[PDB]
Design a protein around this ligand. Sequence first.
Ligand SMILES: CC(C)c1c(C(=O)N(C)[C@H](C)c2ccccc2)nn(-c2ccc(F)cc2)c1CC[C@@H](O)C[C@@H](O)CC(=O)O
Ligand SMILES: CC(C)c1c(C(=O)N(C)[C@H](C)c2ccccc2)nn(-c2ccc(F)cc2)c1CC[C@@H](O)C[C@@H](O)CC(=O)O
Ligand SMILES: CC(C)c1c(C(=O)N(C)[C@H](C)c2ccccc2)nn(-c2ccc(F)cc2)c1CC[C@@H](O)C[C@@H](O)CC(=O)O
Ligand SMILES: CC(C)c1c(C(=O)N(C)[C@H](C)c2ccccc2)nn(-c2ccc(F)cc2)c1CC[C@@H](O)C[C@@H](O)CC(=O)O
Lengths: 404, 394, 405, 420
Amino acid sequence: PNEECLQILGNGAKFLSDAEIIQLVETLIETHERGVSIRRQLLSKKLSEPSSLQYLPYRDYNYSLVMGACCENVIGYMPIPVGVAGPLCLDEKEFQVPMATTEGCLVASTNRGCRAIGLGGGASSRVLADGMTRGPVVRLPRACDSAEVKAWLETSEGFAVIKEAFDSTSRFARLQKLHTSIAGRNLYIRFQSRSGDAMGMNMISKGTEKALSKLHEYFPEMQILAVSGNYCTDKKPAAINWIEGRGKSVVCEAVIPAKVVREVLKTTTEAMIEVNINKNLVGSAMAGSIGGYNAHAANIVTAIYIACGQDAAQNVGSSNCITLMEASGPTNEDLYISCTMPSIEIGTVGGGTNLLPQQACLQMLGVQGACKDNPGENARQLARIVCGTVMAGELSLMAALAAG
Amino acid sequence: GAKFLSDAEIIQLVNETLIETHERGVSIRRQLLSKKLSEPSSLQYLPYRDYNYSLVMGACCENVIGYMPIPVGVAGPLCLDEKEFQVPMATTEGCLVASTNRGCRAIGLGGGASSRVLADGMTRGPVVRLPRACDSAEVKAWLETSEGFAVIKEAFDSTSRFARLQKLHTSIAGRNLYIRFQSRSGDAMGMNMISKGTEKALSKLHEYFPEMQILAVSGNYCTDKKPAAINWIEGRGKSVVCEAVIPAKVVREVLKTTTEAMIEVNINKNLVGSAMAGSIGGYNAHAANIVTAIYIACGQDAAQNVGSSNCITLMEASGPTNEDLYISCTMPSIEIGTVGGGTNLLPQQACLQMLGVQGACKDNPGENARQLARIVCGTVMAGELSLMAALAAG
Amino acid sequence: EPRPNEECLQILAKFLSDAEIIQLVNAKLIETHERGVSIRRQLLSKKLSEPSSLQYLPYRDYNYSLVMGACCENVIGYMPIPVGVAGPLCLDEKEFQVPMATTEGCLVASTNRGCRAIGLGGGASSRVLADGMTRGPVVRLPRACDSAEVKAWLETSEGFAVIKEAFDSTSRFARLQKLHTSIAGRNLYIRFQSRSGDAMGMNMISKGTEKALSKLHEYFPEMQILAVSGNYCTDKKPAAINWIEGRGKSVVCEAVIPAKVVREVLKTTTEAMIEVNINKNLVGSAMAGSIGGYNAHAANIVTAIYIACGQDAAQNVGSSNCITLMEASGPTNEDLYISCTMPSIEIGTVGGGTNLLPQQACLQMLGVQGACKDNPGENARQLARIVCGTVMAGELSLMAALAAG
Amino acid sequence: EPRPNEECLQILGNAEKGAKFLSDAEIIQLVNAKHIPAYKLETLIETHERGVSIRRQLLSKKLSEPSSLQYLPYRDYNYSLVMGACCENVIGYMPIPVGVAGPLCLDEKEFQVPMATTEGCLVASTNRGCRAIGLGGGASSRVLADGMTRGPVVRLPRACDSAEVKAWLETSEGFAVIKEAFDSTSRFARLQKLHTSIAGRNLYIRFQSRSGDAMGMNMISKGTEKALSKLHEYFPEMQILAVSGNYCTDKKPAAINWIEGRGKSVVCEAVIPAKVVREVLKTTTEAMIEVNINKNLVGSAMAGSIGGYNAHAANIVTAIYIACGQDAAQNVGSSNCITLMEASGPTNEDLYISCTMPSIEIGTVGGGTNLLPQQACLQMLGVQGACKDNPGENARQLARIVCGTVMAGELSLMAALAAG
Ligand SMILES: CC(C)c1c(C(=O)N(C)[C@H](C)c2ccccc2)nn(-c2ccc(F)cc2)c1CC[C@@H](O)C[C@@H](O)CC(=O)O
Ligand SMILES: CC(C)c1c(C(=O)N(C)[C@H](C)c2ccccc2)nn(-c2ccc(F)cc2)c1CC[C@@H](O)C[C@@H](O)CC(=O)O
Ligand SMILES: CC(C)c1c(C(=O)N(C)[C@H](C)c2ccccc2)nn(-c2ccc(F)cc2)c1CC[C@@H](O)C[C@@H](O)CC(=O)O
Ligand SMILES: CC(C)c1c(C(=O)N(C)[C@H](C)c2ccccc2)nn(-c2ccc(F)cc2)c1CC[C@@H](O)C[C@@H](O)CC(=O)O
């Protein structure tokens, strides 16, 4: 049928077959899975190998939370294996850390690092700072004019006006001190604020847009070139994130007894320190690294991020880490280790954390959703878990490299 | 033995290979895990049934408790090098696939994109130590001689069919010597292959310099999974460039902006903005978004998005009336493969097959990985085009 | 003629000869400074493979009184650096004659051409955006939990007030700004920042830092001061922190050069200049992996002015940080807009080499010599503006030379 | 009594008279009336010094304070070597105090190192570092690489075209043609392997070559021009945008210099006995190492440094550079340094120190090294001029002296910081 199909669709789509809808070519089709099915069939005929989609699964997945929220042009889902590393003994608690990865040995190695920490009295961590950022670029007629705006934003009165505009957008919108940089007639303004338990990009962007609108009322000659002028900086390496922080700034530490270094990690404290200095400090320095003073923080960040519904593209900055090691204890034979991660971009509400499987992994760690009594606590706790697990990862890989 | 015993019998015995069957092994491990969690019901919506664990166990993941479904969208057709690609993207970020898809449309109506692979070579950068700086200097000089390099190359190349050692890059720090081994790796990403070659090459170097200590097979000089200027300047894995010209009409109708607006935003965001932020290699809008999405979909090492997303996006006016938009994306360090690791799994192979790059290329070793790298760079450009337009239009 | 060692000891300076004093040094004070230099020169010459090496190194008639125990030790003479003049530099409705000490041919003359282009373009305008010298000590506590506690303490209003009071007590020019702190495990890096009148401020900030750390130690007795400089300042090394946060004076300068002037004086076009600027100073520096080096030769101008005006020339490492921007301007879109932004000019008009008279002569040329009584810091800020303006002149001329080929 | 401008031109125009018969005021009047250019006063007047004197008098009138130049010296200086070579619009000279640090015990030789500075304690502190090295058996150094660079930017119509040029330059045949063109510009020109980087249709080409005992910027730039001209024969659609595209990189901080090297790449080392660390440096080996790790490595890391893993290499580099007629603006990259320290010896109480400097840009011929006072400081170190028997040896020796003196400076300042 050709003309009859248009009449039935006006009434609904359940009476029409799959081949009839394809003949003509989201909201038109009744069920979400059927929409995926038709899209897959249309796609298959465009590929040189239509049987490509055979092993890409799609059936029985809950698309209701994905459509119009997380993904478009959906043709199915990608299963990433999830392993568990733990217990991670952190701040007098014990965590079972979910890790989504396809790299062999990663989960097992991280698990060994956890064991080392666990037999060593446990790890301790602190959140040092919290605030997601957006760094728009604005332009004025002259550099003297951009200078005037910078000076105006630095006054208590000027900042209060911008803060009021920013804070009016959301419950959690609370503008911190502005960071500004001039480049001739350009002005780069770094807006920073806490965002409850959300990663905060949407919240900060909404606050930024309103703040820039209010700024335009005081400086009508100002042009808003882009709401992001890469001064944030989001999803690109930047020294500003390393020095100023972005999202959660975290530190974590543990002391590993000499006995544990030998038995669990198959190495010595002295060997670990020498590798740390010459690989993570000198090596990264020779390579021209900004913020990459670690062995494989990225491995742990990415694995946790994928498992817990985070924005995995943010591993670029979230993996920023300096790993430090020194001799400790009365006999100077125990291993003190610390990991400092100034730019963990993380959340427990919104985005991929709205999906049930991702919520399962968040629930494992007891951080799923918003914390009503203490806004931000779940996201802060997750950041502490990430930093702690990174340290476990550092211990085991460094031990492997030290032992050869 | 264990087949006749019940699930509760194995658990109470404790309170990997014994279970024999894969799924029941995952089931029991989940049950053991549940009693360690504050809420045992946490695992309820973490799926595990009916998944092919045979290719995972002892290869891709350990302590497996299930799988994480990441939604896969499609952006395309991507008109690249006279071909058309349907690009799979695994993401939970709303608007990403749709925005990338709009960028593809702009390129498609603009006559298509053209790309080139400029370099190919995975790297490993061990740190070795000598008694003195004079000694490490001697090793550096020895490695720089034709005969010295030939001996190391012979040892390196003996480890694998695809192992073919390129020119060594060496840096001294006192008595420390950092040696960057580089080689092609067929269609594999190559980390295991390069590491195996490196280990044998260092063993051979130790024959000539017996006082040399191999401190670490990776001294962060590679550099793997950390931001590093060396990857930006020297390249790592695949170095790729891609370009297109977008007609003024297409910029207006599809991208909802102007060529002039796009150029001004690109200069002041991607160049000046990144400069003010102190970026090394981050001269782009969101290359990382596209890299990560393709990487997860195509069984790549997503942790390598750190360096793989290195990108400089350039825009200028083009055409007779100087009103068309020329765009280029240059990505010097795409770390990518079509065999090994996550690319061994069937669902991941499905997305690779969509692009026609699955597995090793028999007739032309490396062609599939090179093609995928070109697709990544091209898709990045599509993403750049759409996001920049969104920012320029406000 | 030469007297025995025992007969020379009973007398000892003016009565003794030069040959006799040398014998006393070899056996194992002087009336004038110059003779003291002469003796040291003679002692040194014998140690050298070529005994007449110091022949053309001048030393006579120089005022060593302001140098000894203040600027240099083990003095064997002076190094004359040729000084040229570039100008007039038309900046902020004033005209400056800029002294430049250099041995690079074409530098002064090229910079002079840049000044000519600015002068025929209606002049330059500049602004000082920030002012504060920094010192970044490293302190260490028993644990990261402890260093975190100190960071939190320093971030409180009452915690900062106590530290500010201690810091500001060391000098009348001291005014401690908001602290920048960074943790690295049990390490804490604290970036102290304050204005310093017309001085570059390193000595002043360090003194304030020591006092502030002493006060902090009263509240945290377990804190170890590892180094008064933990490279977090950062002084005399390249550092993104200086680029992003600023150090000393942060300055911006701008001008519009008419199309006619670009053509006649600079021998190029506005279009060519912009194209070279984008692809050299932005894309080129990006490809090179530069942090803060988004310019043609700011270092040339900074160094030349610094040597001429008694600045710390080693500070050109950070002081030369610059981003040069160019775009089309004017009603016909044919004029050249240029800006230079320099966030970390480390500069002073009192103390160090600026205490010497020849160096003061060059400072007097620009009208910035000494401390401004009416407005503390005004002379140092003015000199910073002159540097940024002269950098822009240098940028115009070299970029034109490169564009024209 | 002053004379009219028309009469003064006839006196100056005459061969048997010149500016000798004209007064200062009459020459001043001729420049102000635009008959005589101010930048050519040295050639037009009988002596160079009077030419400088006239320019000073011209300048003094323009200033708000007419007596500003009073204490800026100019008399009795040899301008003949400066004019048309080192400086323009000369109004005198700036005396920088020169101090001596040493003996520096380096490679079984002893050096007395000249340092031009106005920073109090710098020479004396560096001298203390030398003394520590001397009692420690001396320093050893090695030159690892030698090659000045220039990094032009060229442009092609498309990225596919720039890719083609990159591939062409990477072929043995393509490189041989370019090397032939480059090397034909100077006797010392020996082009090393090219480093190329694409940015869309842009191509950045890093030319590197030894340059005898010269710093080599002019030599390399001349070779680059000829090589690009030859490349343009094969690729006529190529546009040479700039002979320097900041890919060199000259006088700006750049990771490329840190990683690839520029000029002379040098390493130096010494072992200081525990007794010497205690008595001379007023500290301990343990304290030195702890400060070095947390300041020069961790501290510089927290600050986001590329190449600045040291205490004050820039102080030593700048002081030697000014004293020895180097380009002091090149201390930006020349001061790149990583300082390393560890425990050494049978009892693990002695201090091993190393300094690695990948990008020392230095020469002993050309530029400011042509001036006699600067040559005096070069003669002190026995490195003045070109080494005929071994081209580059004098410049290489100076680079080793710089690295060794840096290490001396590092020892002393780090000791001061460790002791408090
Ligand atoms: C983390 C784990 C995946 C691992 C380990 C590792 O930890 N083990 C083998 C130990 C013994 C272990 C113990 C218990 C259970 C399982 C495995 N060793 N390597 C590794 C490194 C360099 C090399 F050349 C070849 C391999 C890798 C790959 C790291 C990789 O993803 C980043 C690495 O490149 C970052 C860096 O160090 O530069
Ligand atoms: C890519 C897409 C996910 C997107 C778009 C976007 O492209 N669109 C909205 C257009 C109109 C579109 C067209 C067709 C279909 C769907 C959507 N706009 N933003 C975005 C940017 C800044 C901002 F403040 C708030 C939002 C984002 C998020 C980018 C984000 O992941 C990296 C970004 O932060 C990197 C950067 O620019 O710094
Ligand atoms: C600044 C001046 C000293 C100069 C000029 C220059 O400005 N001129 C020649 C013009 C025409 C001029 C006009 C009026 C009077 C005198 C001279 N041209 N070059 C230069 C550049 C690249 C090159 F390959 C060879 C030479 C240089 C050397 C710059 C140098 O110190 C930093 C430079 O390397 C920084 C960079 O661009 O990378
Ligand atoms: C090098 C010397 C000039 C010096 C010394 C120094 O070495 N001494 C005092 C010792 C005891 C000494 C011994 C023998 C003879 C004379 C002097 N101590 N400081 C110094 C450092 C930080 C500080 F807060 C205040 C002063 C400085 C200034 C360094 C300065 O130019 C770069 C420095 O900022 C680089 C850095 O460390 O960040």
